[PDB]
Ligand binder design. Structure first.
Ligand SMILES: CCCCCC/C=C/CCCCCCCC(=O)OC[C@H](COP(=O)(O)OCCN)OC(=O)CCCCCCC/C=C/CCCCCCCC
Ligand SMILES: CCCCCC/C=C\CCCCCCCC(=O)OC[C@H](COP(=O)(O)OCCN)OC(=O)CCCCCCC/C=C\CCCCCCCC
Ligand SMILES: CCCCCC/C=C\CCCCCCCC(=O)OC[C@H](COP(=O)(O)OCCN)OC(=O)CCCCCCC/C=C\CCCCCCCC
Lengths: 79, 80
């Protein structure tokens, strides 16, 4: 049941993004990855992209989202 | 505070989902669509080719002999 597993992942992400520890951990991990391969080459200006977009993703998962619509958008739930 | 367990749960869900071909097909279609538009079109040079090369590798990685706690340790959500 892909739809339900995707919805569960979305729910878990909504829970995890509420903790500052989560943001700090993912920030440090991605900052380390941005300085080495593969990301260093695959994503130009990796660190700046990270600085700008990690807070936006955190906010997004803390906002009023529609899990079934999200999972439909990526093709894992029907409409 | 129990981020470690939530991370392990996400990893387990991903391992389950990567077992289905419908998953690979759907994520492939979604990311192929995204590679042709903003933001990815600009953030990831040669997005479509990067996708073609790396999506099977990520799928295999989550289908392989992995330890969810080890992944979560690597990304800093379980302590070690
Ligand atoms: C490039 C190839 C790399 C190999 C694979 C490695 C995967 C990397 C994941 C990067 C994917 C970046 C996709 C960015 C596309 C995007 O910005 O669309 C998000 C849109 C736009 O939202 P808004 O403009 O704010 O308006 C609607 C309000 N809800 O939001 C969505 O509805 C979709 C959210 C996607 C997150 C869903 C996560 C659920 C988990 C599913 C299973 C796990 C697979 C995840 C793979 C990535 C797919 C997101
Ligand atoms: C570019 C930053 C933009 C900020 C927004 C973030 C949006 C989407 C996430 C972008 C995905 C980029 C991830 C880079 C992964 C990478 O290149 O690292 C390679 C390494 C090399 O693997 P190995 O050393 O062989 O593993 C041994 C450990 N047992 O990959 C890894 O180690 C595994 C990392 C996978 C972690 C996923 C676990 C899921 C946990 C929580 C999900 C919620 C957080 C999502 C962010 C994590 C992104 C990976
Ligand atoms: C790894 C499995 C974990 C599953 C968790 C899902 C992880 C990430 C979900 C992605 C977050 C989507 C939420 C959208 C919320 C939002 O408002 O952002 C939408 C914005 C819209 O962008 P714009 O505002 O239009 O900017 C235009 C100016 N350039 O889009 C995004 O946030 C997406 C940014 C992500 C940047 C991706 C860069 C990394 C991409 C590919 C790296 C591939 C590495 C693979 C290596 C694997 C090695 C084996």
């Amino acid at each position: 049941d892909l739809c339900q597993e995707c919805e569960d992942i979305v729910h878990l992400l909504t829970k995890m993004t509420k903790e500052d520890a989560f943001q700090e951990a993912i920030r440090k991990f991605l900052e380390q990855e941005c300085d080495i391969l593969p990301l260093k080459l695959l994503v130009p200006r990796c660190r700046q992209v990270l600085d700008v977009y990690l807070p936006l993703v955190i906010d997004y998962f803390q906002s009023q989202i529609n899990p079934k619509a999200i999972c439909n958008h990526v093709g894992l739930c029907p409409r």
